Design an enzyme around this catalytic site. Structure first.
Site, PDB file in Angstrom:
ATOM      1  N   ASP A   1       9.864  -6.136  -5.727  1.00 26.78           N
ATOM      2  CA  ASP A   1       9.017  -6.782  -4.756  1.00 26.78           C
ATOM      3  C   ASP A   1       9.070  -8.287  -5.094  1.00 26.78           C
ATOM      4  OD1 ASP A   1       6.968  -7.713  -2.979  1.00 26.78           O
ATOM      5  OD2 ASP A   1       6.062  -5.706  -3.049  1.00 26.78           O
TER       6      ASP A   1
ATOM      7  N   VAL B   1      11.436   4.639   5.972  1.00 23.75           N
ATOM      8  CA  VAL B   1      10.377   4.996   6.918  1.00 23.75           C
ATOM      9  C   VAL B   1       9.584   3.754   7.310  1.00 23.75           C
ATOM     10  CG1 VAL B   1      10.203   7.337   6.046  1.00 23.75           C
ATOM     11  CG2 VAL B   1       8.730   5.553   5.088  1.00 23.75           C
ATOM     12  N   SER B   2      10.113   2.569   6.985  1.00 21.81           N
ATOM     13  CA  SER B   2       9.404   1.346   7.331  1.00 21.81           C
ATOM     14  C   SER B   2       9.757   0.833   8.701  1.00 21.81           C
ATOM     15  CB  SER B   2       9.713   0.186   6.360  1.00 21.81           C
ATOM     16  OG  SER B   2       9.368   0.692   5.091  1.00 21.81           O
ATOM     17  N   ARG B   3      10.916   0.145   8.723  1.00 25.48           N
ATOM     18  CA  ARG B   3      11.366  -0.470   9.970  1.00 25.48           C
ATOM     19  C   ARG B   3      12.878  -0.314  10.216  1.00 25.48           C
ATOM     20  NH1 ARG B   3      11.098  -1.654  12.861  1.00 25.48           N
ATOM     21  NH2 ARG B   3       9.946  -3.109  14.180  1.00 25.48           N
TER      22      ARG B   3
ATOM     23  N   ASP C   1      13.116   7.519   9.445  1.00 22.41           N
ATOM     24  CA  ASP C   1      12.033   7.824  10.354  1.00 22.41           C
ATOM     25  C   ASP C   1      11.996   6.793  11.452  1.00 22.41           C
ATOM     26  OD1 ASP C   1       9.703   9.283  11.185  1.00 22.41           O
ATOM     27  OD2 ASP C   1       8.539   7.590  10.451  1.00 22.41           O
TER      28      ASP C   1
ATOM     29  N   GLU D   1      15.600   2.453  18.231  1.00 23.86           N
ATOM     30  CA  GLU D   1      14.664   3.492  18.683  1.00 23.86           C
ATOM     31  C   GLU D   1      13.898   3.159  19.953  1.00 23.86           C
ATOM     32  OE1 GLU D   1      12.330   2.938  14.805  1.00 23.86           O
ATOM     33  OE2 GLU D   1      10.752   3.361  16.287  1.00 23.86           O
TER      34      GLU D   1
ATOM     35  N   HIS E   1       0.802  -1.222   0.000  1.00 22.86           N
ATOM     36  CA  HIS E   1       0.000   0.000   0.000  1.00 22.86           C
ATOM     37  C   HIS E   1       0.840   1.280   0.000  1.00 22.86           C
ATOM     38  CE1 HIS E   1      -3.156  -2.700   2.040  1.00 22.86           C
ATOM     39  NE2 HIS E   1      -3.089  -2.892   0.723  1.00 22.86           N
ATOM     40  N   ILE E   2       1.863   1.340   0.835  1.00 24.37           N
ATOM     41  CA  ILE E   2       2.704   2.519   0.949  1.00 24.37           C
ATOM     42  C   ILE E   2       3.616   2.704  -0.239  1.00 24.37           C
ATOM     43  CG2 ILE E   2       4.529   3.610   2.219  1.00 24.37           C
ATOM     44  CD1 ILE E   2       3.115   1.783   4.707  1.00 24.37           C
TER      45      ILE E   2
ATOM     46  N   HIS F   1       9.939   8.365  14.243  1.00 28.92           N
ATOM     47  CA  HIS F   1       8.861   7.457  13.923  1.00 28.92           C
ATOM     48  C   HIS F   1       7.525   8.205  13.811  1.00 28.92           C
ATOM     49  CE1 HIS F   1       8.307   2.892  13.967  1.00 28.92           C
ATOM     50  NE2 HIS F   1       7.457   3.464  13.118  1.00 28.92           N
TER      51      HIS F   1
HETATM   52  N1  LIG Z   1       7.162   4.855   9.997  1.00 27.61           N
HETATM   53  C1  LIG Z   1       5.840   4.789  10.334  1.00 27.61           C
HETATM   54  O1  LIG Z   1       5.266   5.655  10.997  1.00 27.61           O
HETATM   55  C2  LIG Z   1       4.964   3.586   9.806  1.00 27.61           C
HETATM   56  C3  LIG Z   1       3.563   3.632   9.893  1.00 27.61           C
HETATM   57  C4  LIG Z   1       2.920   2.488   9.362  1.00 27.61           C
HETATM   58  C5  LIG Z   1       3.609   1.445   8.814  1.00 27.61           C
HETATM   59  N2  LIG Z   1       4.961   1.513   8.793  1.00 27.61           N
HETATM   60  C6  LIG Z   1       5.783   0.358   8.156  1.00 27.61           C
HETATM   61  O2  LIG Z   1       5.610   0.430   6.743  1.00 27.61           O
HETATM   62  C7  LIG Z   1       5.837  -0.946   6.117  1.00 27.61           C
HETATM   63  C8  LIG Z   1       4.987  -0.935   4.918  1.00 27.61           C
HETATM   64  O3  LIG Z   1       3.601  -1.251   5.354  1.00 27.61           O
HETATM   65  P1  LIG Z   1       2.544  -1.615   4.196  1.00 27.61           P
HETATM   66  O4  LIG Z   1       1.216  -1.406   4.784  1.00 27.61           O
HETATM   67  O5  LIG Z   1       2.977  -1.039   2.934  1.00 27.61           O
HETATM   68  O6  LIG Z   1       2.831  -3.255   4.034  1.00 27.61           O
HETATM   69  P2  LIG Z   1       2.395  -4.181   2.843  1.00 27.61           P
HETATM   70  O7  LIG Z   1       2.241  -5.572   3.397  1.00 27.61           O
HETATM   71  O8  LIG Z   1       1.173  -3.562   2.175  1.00 27.61           O
HETATM   72  O9  LIG Z   1       3.685  -4.067   1.951  1.00 27.61           O
HETATM   73  C9  LIG Z   1       4.827  -4.992   2.024  1.00 27.61           C
HETATM   74  C10 LIG Z   1       5.268  -5.344   0.670  1.00 27.61           C
HETATM   75  O10 LIG Z   1       6.724  -5.674   0.686  1.00 27.61           O
HETATM   76  C11 LIG Z   1       6.915  -6.734  -0.228  1.00 27.61           C
HETATM   77  N3  LIG Z   1       8.160  -7.338   0.157  1.00 27.61           N
HETATM   78  C12 LIG Z   1       8.479  -8.135   1.237  1.00 27.61           C
HETATM   79  N4  LIG Z   1       9.740  -8.516   1.310  1.00 27.61           N
HETATM   80  C13 LIG Z   1      10.352  -7.979   0.261  1.00 27.61           C
HETATM   81  C14 LIG Z   1      11.756  -8.063  -0.160  1.00 27.61           C
HETATM   82  N5  LIG Z   1      12.709  -8.728   0.447  1.00 27.61           N
HETATM   83  N6  LIG Z   1      11.993  -7.361  -1.322  1.00 27.61           N
HETATM   84  C15 LIG Z   1      11.105  -6.653  -2.020  1.00 27.61           C
HETATM   85  N7  LIG Z   1       9.767  -6.543  -1.638  1.00 27.61           N
HETATM   86  C16 LIG Z   1       9.413  -7.229  -0.487  1.00 27.61           C
HETATM   87  C17 LIG Z   1       5.695  -7.674  -0.073  1.00 27.61           C
HETATM   88  O11 LIG Z   1       5.618  -8.648  -0.993  1.00 27.61           O
HETATM   89  C18 LIG Z   1       4.634  -6.596  -0.033  1.00 27.61           C
HETATM   90  O12 LIG Z   1       4.179  -6.180  -1.390  1.00 27.61           O
HETATM   91  C19 LIG Z   1       5.344  -1.847   7.314  1.00 27.61           C
HETATM   92  O13 LIG Z   1       6.089  -3.017   7.157  1.00 27.61           O
HETATM   93  C20 LIG Z   1       5.590  -1.094   8.631  1.00 27.61           C
HETATM   94  O14 LIG Z   1       6.657  -1.597   9.340  1.00 27.61           O
HETATM   95  C21 LIG Z   1       5.723   2.581   9.269  1.00 27.61           C
END
Ligand SMILES: NC(=O)c1ccc[n+]([C@@H]2O[C@H](COP(=O)([O-])OP(=O)(O)OC[C@H]3O[C@@H](n4cnc5c(N)ncnc54)[C@H](O)[C@@H]3O)[C@@H](O)[C@H]2O)c1
Ligand SMILES: NC(=O)c1ccc[n+]([C@@H]2O[C@H](COP(=O)([O-])OP(=O)(O)OC[C@H]3O[C@@H](n4cnc5c(N)ncnc54)[C@H](O)[C@@H]3O)[C@@H](O)[C@H]2O)c1
EC number: 1.1.1.28
Lengths: 332, 332
Positions: free
Chosen positions: A176, A234-236, A260, A265, A156-157, A297
């Site tokens: 991906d 900004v993921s993890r 982020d 953290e 989604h992001i 974050h």
């Molecule tokens: N910083 C913040 O404030 C905040 C807020 C919300 C979520 N997040 C983070 O954002 C990340 C994204 O969330 P989302 O809702 O998009 O998740 P999502 O499940 O919709 O997206 C994950 C995607 O990554 C792909 N993927 C997995 N491993 C991979 C790899 N090795 N190489 C390439 N692609 C790979 C998957 O197949 C999937 O399409 C979450 O994992 C979460 O930790 C951060």
């Protein structure tokens, strides 16, 4: 009475809470600023359900003091179902919801903005201006549209980020493990993460904190990258080996880093360390570099996200309480 | 001695200057870092044309002095012609070119990024992170997609600004005195400025400094704008009554202000004042406001822009000198 008790309610959440109440005037809604602890459960005694949001673990003791207070329905205003003592929960027949998606654009916009800033050397420019050094040189920018932007993860992001970066005119490649067919039609995907690293000026990560990705950004991946690469995370936290990015920054290979999130953290982020001994010298250093952007974050933190966190948590709680199919129940 | 003399050349321009020279070996090029004034005009003596770039006015006296040295051909490296004494230039049969399109993206991206930062409260966030206050709350952001973006001027920059803002998913409306068919087919345009002011969360100006445009942003147009409006000016200072914006900021009406340009920037911007008495207390105050982003006329300052500013300027000047048709001639 259909009494929803909410914990950890922030000032900025109140407006969405009020709103929720005005759409459900028959429901009794109470809340505290305090977190959910075995001593705070007694506060929800009477309620039919609790809406929660906190990193403070959901300790068996806690769950237990809840059920002992008659509550067994729990609605998370966040995504994480991690600090929940799950064996305990299933034990007391706990019904649990969360909020999986509140605002993807919040996080994608933040990544986009932070990348562009680093490209522009905006921080070096802001620092000059704050000291009243208003000379242009040498802080010349790099346009976003002149870049190849590599997106790792197209969930989604990631897709919103691609959308945004395409809007700028950047050439956007992706990677991906499971290619969404729509994007596959379009031609975004490259075959190997390595193909991404060799051609992206800008890399942004939108991938979960899964063991196979832990430290995927390291001395070996950085050595594959283009000179003057910009990395965004900004993921993890654990996606990135901070010491390797610091090495990359120090050798001048990494143009800049926007983070982020940070692998150390927990216990650092979301605390005021002003006038105190900062606990993490490495983070303190990152915060001060001119070509690094540290945000605690905060990528999720927008009026839109927060709106959806509140409303949807309260929609799920009411649904649990009314014996309705919950919109976003947690597999216990 | 088919000669071209260039003013205010900077280190970062030189690379582009040699690329140009290397493709036009039969042309002699000389330059100075100094600005074009009456007293530096003499350095052009011998040249057949002049290549310039400065916010400092091209006065009647500077223009007279150019001529009194054989020069009537002037190629600016930039877009704006608002600081040239046209009446004097015409009297002297000056031939003038500019570089209308060195990179509409540079300025457009700057505008978008500053607007997004302000919407995000990124400055407030950055200042507490630098203090080591790693609490995100209460510094909540506003997403770009939640905004109505109003673009004043749908010319080369405004159009790229629209593109970008649409990439973010924002609702984009516009106002130009001259409508672009392709744009108008899409229904972007509103019928008047007042209509734009009424609907826009974010206003960005992309119009030239012409008499009719001076202080178009004033206490009266601000009173018409929405609550929490964000105003962006990367075009020209005098478009904005600075005090009016300051009152708009102080009343709480204006959420923040991004300025690249300033009424009074000439002689302030692109100068080092570190450890000096700042000459403009009003500008120093703006610089330090949490909801004001000040850049010293650096919207243009990108590697893509600076190459084109140099190359097209010289292209244009050669054409003038060789009596051929200049590609982007200005009206005198
Ligand atoms: N910083 C913040 O404030 C905040 C807020 C919300 C979520 N997040 C983070 O954002 C990340 C994204 O969330 P989302 O809702 O998009 O998740 P999502 O499940 O919709 O997206 C994950 C995607 O990554 C792909 N993927 C997995 N491993 C991979 C790899 N090795 N190489 C390439 N692609 C790979 C998957 O197949 C999937 O399409 C979450 O994992 C979460 O930790 C951060
Ligand atoms: N800060 C910087 O570094 C920088 C760099 C380049 C340009 N600029 C400024 O930005 C201006 C815009 O540049 P551009 O390349 O888009 O020019 P352009 O000529 O392509 O666009 C100007 C547009 O504004 C329209 N316009 C004029 N007055 C208007 C008014 N009162 N209301 C609504 N529309 C109006 C014109 O019809 C035209 O569509 C330049 O004139 C210059 O002043 C600043």
């Amino acid at each position: 009475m259909t009494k929803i008790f909410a914990y950890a309610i922030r000032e900025d959440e109140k407006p969405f809470l009020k709103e929720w109440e005005d759409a459900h005037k028959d429901v009794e809604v109470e809340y505290t600023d305090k977190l959910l602890t075995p001593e705070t459960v007694a506060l929800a005694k009477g309620a039919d359900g609790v809406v929660v949001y906190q990193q403070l673990d959901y300790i068996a003791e806690t769950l237990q003091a809840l059920a002992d207070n008659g509550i067994t329905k729990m609605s998370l205003r966040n995504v994480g179902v991690d600090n929940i003592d799950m064996a305990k929960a299933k034990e007391l027949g706990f019904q649990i919801t969360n909020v999986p998606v509140y605002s993807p654009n919040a996080i994608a916009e933040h990544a986009a903005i932070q990348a562009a800033r680093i490209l522009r050397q905006d921080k070096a420019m802001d620092e000059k201006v704050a000291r009243h050094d208003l000379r242009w040189a040498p802080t010349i920018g790099r346009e976003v549209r002149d870049q190849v932007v590599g997106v790792v993860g197209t969930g989604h992001i990631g897709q919103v980020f691609m959308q945004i970066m395409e809007g700028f005119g950047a050439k956007v490649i992706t990677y991906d493990i499971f290619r969404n067919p729509e994007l596959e039609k379009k031609g975004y995907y490259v075959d190997s993460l390595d193909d991404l690293y060799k051609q992206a000026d800008v890399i942004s990560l939108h991938v979960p904190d899964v063991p196979a990705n832990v430290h995927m950004i390291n001395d070996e991946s950085i050595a594959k990258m283009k000179q003057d690469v910009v990395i965004v995370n900004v993921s993890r936290g654990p996606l990135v080996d901070t010491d390797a990015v610091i090495r990359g920054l120090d050798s001048g290979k990494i143009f800049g880093y926007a983070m982020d999130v940070y692998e150390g953290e927990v216990g650092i982020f979301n605390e005021d360390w002003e006038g105190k001994e900062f606990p993490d010298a490495r983070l303190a250093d990152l915060i001060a570099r001119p070509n690094v952007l540290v945000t605690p974050h905060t990528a999720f933190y927008t009026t839109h996200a927060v709106r959806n966190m509140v409303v949807k948590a309260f929609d799920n709680n009411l649904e649990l309480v009314e014996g309705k199919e919950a919109e976003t129940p947690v597999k216990v």
